[PDB]
Ligand binder design. Structure first.
Ligand SMILES: *[C@@H]1O[C@H](CO)[C@@H](O[C@@H]2O[C@H](CO)[C@@H](O[C@@H]3O[C@H](CO)[C@@H](O)[C@H](O)[C@@H]3O)[C@H](O)[C@H]2NC(C)=O)[C@H](O)[C@H]1NC(C)=O
Ligand SMILES: *[C@@H]1O[C@H](CO)[C@@H](O[C@@H]2O[C@H](CO)[C@@H](O[C@@H]3O[C@H](CO)[C@@H](O)[C@H](O)[C@@H]3O)[C@H](O)[C@H]2NC(C)=O)[C@H](O)[C@H]1NC(C)=O
Ligand SMILES: *[C@@H]1O[C@H](CO)[C@@H](O[C@@H]2O[C@H](CO)[C@@H](O)[C@H](O)[C@H]2NC(C)=O)[C@H](O)[C@H]1NC(C)=O
Ligand SMILES: *[C@@H]1O[C@H](CO)[C@@H](O[C@@H]2O[C@H](CO)[C@@H](O)[C@H](O)[C@H]2NC(C)=O)[C@H](O)[C@H]1NC(C)=O
Ligand SMILES: *[C@@H]1O[C@H](CO)[C@@H](O[C@@H]2O[C@H](CO)[C@@H](O)[C@H](O)[C@H]2NC(C)=O)[C@H](O)[C@H]1NC(C)=O
Ligand SMILES: *[C@@H]1O[C@H](CO)[C@@H](O[C@@H]2O[C@H](CO)[C@@H](O)[C@H](O)[C@H]2NC(C)=O)[C@H](O)[C@H]1NC(C)=O
Ligand SMILES: *[C@@H]1O[C@H](CO)[C@@H](O[C@@H]2O[C@H](CO)[C@@H](O)[C@H](O)[C@H]2NC(C)=O)[C@H](O)[C@H]1NC(C)=O
Ligand SMILES: *[C@@H]1O[C@H](CO)[C@@H](O[C@@H]2O[C@H](CO)[C@@H](O)[C@H](O)[C@H]2NC(C)=O)[C@H](O)[C@H]1NC(C)=O
Ligand SMILES: *[C@@H]1O[C@H](CO)[C@@H](O[C@@H]2O[C@H](CO)[C@@H](O)[C@H](O)[C@H]2NC(C)=O)[C@H](O)[C@H]1NC(C)=O
Ligand SMILES: *[C@@H]1O[C@H](CO)[C@@H](O[C@@H]2O[C@H](CO)[C@@H](O)[C@H](O)[C@H]2NC(C)=O)[C@H](O)[C@H]1NC(C)=O
Ligand SMILES: *[C@@H]1O[C@H](CO)[C@@H](O[C@@H]2O[C@H](CO)[C@@H](O)[C@H](O)[C@H]2NC(C)=O)[C@H](O)[C@H]1NC(C)=O
Ligand SMILES: *[C@@H]1O[C@H](CO)[C@@H](O)[C@H](O)[C@H]1NC(C)=O
Ligand SMILES: *[C@@H]1O[C@H](CO)[C@@H](O)[C@H](O)[C@H]1NC(C)=O
Ligand SMILES: *[C@@H]1O[C@H](CO)[C@@H](O)[C@H](O)[C@H]1NC(C)=O
Lengths: 751, 753
DNA sequence: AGGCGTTTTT
DNA sequence: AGGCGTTTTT
DNA sequence: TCGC
DNA sequence: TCGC
């Protein structure tokens, strides 16, 4: 019965998870029959500061071992405690087929001895400051070596990490090397020619030429960015570059015939020399972000031959203290025929018209365009209508205000054509701002300042639009023709348009909902809807209504005025009534919800009583969420006979008891969440036979009484596969010595 | 020791408070030595459905008794349970000096017999449908009678309540009568001439003349509103009036020589007849709201003789489905020389011209003007500069967007001020200094809840040379230029809260260096701004005393190496700092040590702290108040309050505190209030405090799962400090053992054991 | 001695 | 039987 | 981190 | 509960 790898948790393919258990030593698993099947062990963020020769002898088949964060270096310790990890010399040699080891975020100053089998090692965020030819001796199979972050502001050293010339040459299967944030002044010498990925960003390598990348002819990805930073844009401490620019020899990259990815971000480059990219037929991903290329991208020839480039990042190439009236991409962009994604965020230019992006408009595969954070105040959005293959254009966080002079957007991820105009300065919508954008399927105007009694004339051209996010505006819902000019509209988010609904004395009107014939998903959430609105919603199409964060409590206190508010939503399948200040809920109010309802959320209300037989008025209910209410027990009835309920969430209540056979008639029941309540026990007699059909039974954060004979232990073991965090997350509230500890910290059957 | 009016709570001036204890009967107070000094008893919202002759015999000196909500009528019951209250006949006669009784929200159908001494009775929201000459017999001293709400949508009846002719005549000291929401078709006949206040609103009295107010010449206040309602404005079920208008005889009120207050709201009036107000020299308060007087107020002579009118409500006199281009108040308004307050909310007119309120501009005592919810899109704000005594003008909830083209709430600081304007909830996107011409006298201005998206830089507020308070909360201000707000020489309180959107732009930074140039600034809020990255690393000031920084990301800022380590330090003199809801998962000593040494109040409410090193309080030498509520503390440990600490209040409520280390509080000589509520304490120990427990003014231990075992030690402590523990009598409850879960620590006696 | 705590990337 | 719960005014 |  |  006992899970067998206590205090850890056994998981799928040979993985034992011991993360976050505050262990001071490698667990012995004494009362397991065999540790021979254990091939992966995770000990993340425990407190193991001392490792011994005998610690892994019983785990001799491990292939994967994670020891991250056991002994954090000073700068990474939340309280800046120094930690020094000791490792006896033969500690890891007992695992003769170990393939992957993570020692990151540990206070070690030298590499311990490791087995020949090792393939992937991380020494990142440690205090190892020298790698010489003895550091990783004999690791002939090593393919991947991370040692990032051993000398920077969060894990400081006085000088720099040193990688001696030829130190890694003996690692002749090494393909991936990462040595970022180490204060290096040069690319280490005589690196293994087998390298395909070299990352040396955020060091102090202010000069590069071909000699620094000698014999590395197998490189596919090279990241040399952040070595001459522009600190005006840094979000973190930033080391001032000694020069105006990274010095890059013209022929630096010419011998890297296989190169596919190059990162030159944050290099303080004021010009592009096309010879950098010459002879790289497979250059696919280029990052030029956070440089000073604002003029260069309007003039350069450097893109002429980049005919296989797929992704290009030009973001935050802004001029200090300036925005530009206009920006015109250079004609050489016309050659980027393979280009799928371009990032032009944060260059800072005030008008967007046909000349800005002219040379992108005929590229046959440009799908994705980022134009955020540019202080754009005039935009001829019509230009996007003749682009060859646009799927997503993001103009969010600009200053567009009109024509030129649970996240709803997840629904749009594989759409034909989505535009994001959120976080702009729109106060009214004029249909002319949409000329030539008839192909749009999805549009966000969220987080604008739209304060308008919409009435059918705002969105005239958008005859293909299926999704519209208008959340976080100040829309006045009043005229019945609102949104009826959108013939294909299926999802409409009107959440966080609360301000008008808070006007005491001015009413509103939802009769428009009845005229939206394709509308399937509607949010009216967080609108402060509480008084002076229409008394009936009506639809034949709406299937999901989010009414979270309103005042239905107050509405259902107004005599019968709002008694049939949801009733005319024929076919409604899901209704969210969370956070509606409900202090009671009458049977008549549930009986007048649509009979089609499969999901009702009452999360985070103030219900301290619930009449369970009233679930018979929701014949089709499969999911009921009553979490965050004030239920004192599960009582005043039982789940009623015939109920189709599949999930009941009654977490985060004040439940102290459950009545006999409470769950027993709910034949379809699969999930029950009882967590964060005040149960002293868990009883088979609450469920009867249906406990064996449950897929999840969550009983964490209950103050379970762990006295010696305790009965619940046998129940939880019988369904152990179905109770999340059983091994160490289900804890006792009493007696005193066991408060806050696992129900398995004592054995409560052996006594 | 035991409080001895258990389970109730004894309060000052003979009040015993038994509210909300779910009692099914009048408590006996057996344990009390004497119940003779009990003069007031409150039993609100208990479950007493049956009252007996013997219930009140020990409480024979009661002067006030409140029994409301004990037996709710069906319509008012939250679950629509029917309730019938039984009352034995001599029940209230045991209290021969009873002066005030509240029987409201109880299912009674008959008035019980009452003592002669009674002065104030409420029978509201009951099921009494008839008052006849026997209902209130012998109550010669009765001054006040409320019986509102016995026949309306929330407490329905079949017909209407009936007050039979002359039923109340024998109550010849009766001064206040209220009979609202009763479905009356007429004012009851032969009411007592002693009446000074008569309220008959929200019935169906569609017709009134002098005959209906016969012989009531002592009236000071008459409320006849809501008898012919306009249902287009109702927030609740509304009965359609049978007529276009309430029918009001011209001389209805003429004989009410002493009348001071008249309510004609929601009467469907399309005209005013001046004869209504004639002969009423002391008319002070007039409510004409929710009528159809949109034309009438631009033309009528009705205000000519209202020379003592102080308050006038014209609100929501709008035309159905219409807003007006313009509006001119009638010249008769010029005569309202006593007028202090005028409410013109919700008429719906789009321009506010210099002329619109021309006839108000010379009234010598007009202090307060309400112009909300009018769909005003053009406004000549300059006119308010010429008004003779304006103290507050409210233009909130309109559509103003700029200068005219025509020819914890910071504003609470402004309630005594000489001149405040509220422009909140308008459509401003940029501020132009010209919108402020002639408003140089303004001391307070709200622009909150607009859409202002502007890199303020010193030129926005030029005319406002006397402005002390500026509320800019809930906008989209771009804090960047150092000259922001430096044109406001007298600015003392600035609210920049809920301007978060710019701070959420990933890759564009901001700058707070402007704060250093605001030389009078005493109170600043940067709350709920998502301030977390790419901002200036130092705030500086010599004047700022209160900074609200709640709802930001200091957690993330203090995880960026040393970049923000001295963020608050240069606020010299800072006295209060709110760092609640800043996603703090840890605090180092250096973080507290680099707050200004002047600090008296620090809030860390609702963070994620599960450790706190108490010896770090020595680095806050002037601290008097510390709020750590809503964190994840598991105990009070890792130090004790240090010697010399000036701490007065410590709130550690709503944590997960299971233990307190010995003498944790002992050296805090100044300590007065400690909140330990909503934790997981099984006990409360004198040894946590030592002798300073006697100097505490509040020790809050509710919602802890106290172990109520037979000898339990905490009981003696709590009794020793009983006047200092809120809700001791019934609100401090046991978690265990099972028999006592959820019950008062005094439900058993835990010493006799 | 070793605590602290769920730790993106810059 | 009585339960429900903090209940402004409309 | 926002016209010269 | 929001022009003609
Ligand atoms: C990574 O390398 C950089 C650059 O070599 C290191 O920063 C440098 O640290 C030196 C010496 O510690 C600084 O000089 C000092 O300046 C202060 C104040 O101006 C002065 O009081 C001292 O006496 C001394 O002269 C130097 O400015 C600084 N260089 C730069 C460009 O920032 C850095 O410490 C190394 N490690 C890390 C973790 O960054
Ligand atoms: C530029 O990128 C292309 C696209 O990947 C490279 O072409 C590919 O090169 C590899 C060799 O690394 C080919 O795989 C091999 O094919 C041979 C011959 O049939 C086989 O014996 C090997 O087992 C191996 O699978 C791959 O098929 C080939 N693909 C195409 C579409 O040609 C190209 O070589 C790159 N150019 C440079 C200069 O790096
Ligand atoms: C694009 O590639 C072509 C061909 O490699 C480059 O043109 C050659 O440049 C070489 C070296 O400078 C000159 O000696 C020749 O005149 C050119 N060769 C041919 C065959 O024309 C061209 O410069 C590249 N364009 C850019 C902007 O880098
Ligand atoms: C919500 O708006 C609708 C449509 O504008 C209003 O319903 C109509 O009201 C008119 C009179 O104003 C009646 O003649 C129609 O019979 C109504 N139509 C329907 C479908 O009901 C309705 O009054 C508004 N609701 C509220 C509460 O303002
Ligand atoms: C049972 O309910 C608890 C309490 O709501 C759930 O725990 C939350 O999980 C979400 C997502 O994992 C997190 O954002 C929160 O950290 C958790 N909340 C609390 C209060 O701890 C839990 O996941 C539910 N159980 C299952 C199996 O779904
Ligand atoms: C109108 O109100 C005034 C002021 O309240 C009344 O004048 C007072 O009358 C009382 C009688 O109760 C005298 O004691 C005072 O001497 C008067 N006070 C002042 C300041 O003049 C006046 O009687 C009221 N008139 C009517 C007809 O009601
Ligand atoms: C305001 O009061 C004056 C009294 O000064 C009213 O004047 C009287 O009006 C009636 C008919 O309108 C005349 O017959 C009298 O001769 C007038 N008497 C005096 C003494 O002037 C005046 O009508 C009142 N105003 C309003 C609008 O009712
Ligand atoms: C916030 O703004 C201040 C003032 O504009 C910046 O400090 C100035 O920086 C300039 C150069 O850009 C220097 O000449 C001076 O040190 C400062 N000038 C003045 C007038 O005080 C500061 O850089 C900004 N803070 C951040 C983080 O950008
Ligand atoms: C001790 O803290 C508790 C819990 O934070 C306080 O209880 C709150 O009191 C207000 C009073 O208006 C209530 O509206 C809230 O519902 C209470 N919150 C909770 C979670 O119960 C209590 O007031 C504090 N004690 C004192 C004396 O201030
Ligand atoms: C905070 O206080 C706790 C409780 O005293 C400390 O944890 C104890 O520390 C000793 C180490 O000297 C252990 O042997 C105990 O088992 C720990 N007890 C518990 C209940 O955890 C903790 O070290 C203190 N934290 C710091 C940073 O000093
Ligand atoms: C809902 O169930 C609870 C718990 O059993 C009921 O409360 C008990 O009612 C009995 C007799 O009616 C009392 O003697 C107990 O003291 C109550 N127990 C507790 C823990 O409060 C409650 O009456 C039920 N309500 C309804 C409406 O059926
Ligand atoms: C690029 O490198 C060449 C090498 O001759 C140099 O002369 C030239 O100045 C550079 N050209 C550009 C376009 O930046
Ligand atoms: C009040 O009067 C109306 C009209 O006579 C009538 O329809 C209704 O029955 C009465 N009761 C209530 C509770 O409104
Ligand atoms: C007001 O009442 C008088 C009688 O006092 C009547 O003759 C007149 O028509 C009424 N005028 C208005 C404007 O209602």
């Amino acid at each position: 019965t006992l899970p067998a790898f206590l205090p850890c948790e056994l998981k799928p393919h040979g993985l034992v998870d011991c993360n976050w258990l505050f262990l001071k030593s490698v667990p012995r698993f004494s009362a397991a029959a065999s540790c021979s099947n254990i091939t992966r062990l995770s000990l993340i963020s425990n407190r193991i500061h001392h490792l011994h020769n005998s610690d892994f002898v019983h785990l001799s088949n491990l292939r994967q071992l994670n020891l991250k964060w056991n002994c954090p270096p000073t700068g990474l310790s939340p309280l800046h405690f120094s930690c020094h990890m000791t490792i006896e010399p033969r500690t890891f040699l007992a695992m003769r087929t170990l393939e992957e080891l993570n020692l990151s975020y540990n206070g070690i100053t030298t590499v311990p001895r490791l087995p020949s089998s090792l393939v992937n090692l991380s020494l990142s965020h440690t205090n190892i400051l020298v790698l010489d030819a003895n550091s990783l001796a004999g690791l002939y199979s090593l393919r991947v070596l991370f040692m990032d972050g051993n000398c920077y502001y969060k894990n400081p050293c006085t000088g720099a990490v040193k990688v001696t010339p030829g130190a890694l040459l003996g690692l002749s299967n090494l393909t991936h090397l990462s040595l970022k944030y180490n204060n290096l002044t040069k690319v280490p010498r005589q690196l293994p020619p087998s390298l395909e990925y070299l990352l040396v960003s955020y060091n102090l390598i202010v000069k590069l030429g071909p000699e620094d990348l000698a014999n590395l002819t197998s490189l596919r990805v090279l990241d040399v960015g952040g070595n001459c930073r522009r600190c005006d844009h840094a979000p973190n401490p930033c080391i001032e570059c000694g020069q105006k620019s990274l010095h890059l020899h013209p022929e630096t990259f010419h011998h890297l015939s296989h190169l596919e990815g190059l990162v030159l971000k944050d290099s303080s480059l004021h010009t592009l020399n096309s010879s950098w990219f010459q002879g790289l037929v497979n250059m696919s991903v280029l990052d030029l972000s956070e440089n000073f290329l604002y003029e260069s991208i309007q003039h350069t020839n450097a893109f002429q031959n980049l005919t296989r480039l797929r992704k290009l990042n030009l973001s935050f190439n802004y001029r200090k203290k300036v925005s530009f009236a206009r920006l015109h991409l250079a004609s050489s962009f016309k050659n980027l025929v393979s280009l799928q994604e371009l990032n032009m965020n944060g260059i800072f230019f005030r008008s967007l018209n046909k000349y800005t992006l002219r040379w992108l408009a005929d590229l046959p595969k440009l799908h994705t365009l980022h134009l955020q954070m540019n202080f754009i105040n005039q935009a001829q959005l019509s230009i996007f209508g003749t682009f060859r293959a646009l799927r997503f254009v993001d103009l969010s966080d600009n200053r567009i205000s009109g024509p030129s002079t649970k996240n709803f957007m997840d629904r749009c991820k594989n759409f034909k054509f989505t535009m994001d105009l959120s976080r702009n300065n729109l106060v009214t919508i004029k249909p002319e701002m949409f000329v030539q954008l008839s192909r749009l399927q999805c549009l966000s105007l969220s987080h604008n300042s739209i304060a308008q009694a919409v009435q059918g004339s705002q969105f005239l051209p958008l005859t293909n639009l299926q999704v519209l996010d208008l959340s976080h505006n100040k829309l006045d819902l009043y005229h019945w023709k609102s949104f009826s000019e959108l013939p294909q509209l299926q999802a409409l988010d009107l959440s966080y348009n609360s301000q008008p609904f808070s006007m005491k004395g001015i009413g509103h009107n939802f009769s428009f909902v009845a005229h939206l014939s394709m509308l399937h998903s509607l949010s009216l959430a967080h609108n402060d809807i509480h008084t002076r609105v229409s008394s009936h919603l009506n639809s034949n199409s709406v299937r999901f209504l989010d009414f979270s964060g309103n005042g239905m409590g107050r509405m259902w206190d107004e005599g019968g005025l709002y008694l049939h508010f949801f009733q005319g939503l024929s076919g409604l399948l899901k209704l969210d009534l969370s956070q509606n200040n409900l202090h009671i809920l009458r049977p008549q109010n549930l009986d007048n919800l649509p009979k089609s309802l499969k999901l009702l959320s009452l999360r985070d209300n103030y219900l301290s009583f619930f009449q369970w037989t009233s679930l018979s008025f929701l014949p089709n209910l499969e999911v009921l969420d009553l979490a965050g209410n004030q239920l004192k027990a599960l009582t005043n009835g039982t789940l009623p006979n015939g109920t189709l309920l599949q999930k009941l969430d009654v977490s985060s209540n004040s439940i102290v008891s459950v009545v006999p056979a409470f769950f027993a008639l709910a034949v379809e029941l699969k999930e029950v969440n009882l967590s964060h309540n005040i149960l002293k026990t868990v009883d088979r007699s609450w469920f009867g036979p249906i406990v064996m059909n449950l897929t999840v039974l969550d009983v964490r954060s209950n103050p379970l009484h762990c006295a010696c004979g305790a009965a619940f232990v046998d129940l939880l073991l019988e369904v152990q596969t179905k109770v999340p965090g059983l091994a160490n997350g289900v804890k006792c509230g009493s007696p005193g010595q066991l408060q806050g500890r696992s129900i398995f910290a004592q054995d409560l059957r052996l006594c």
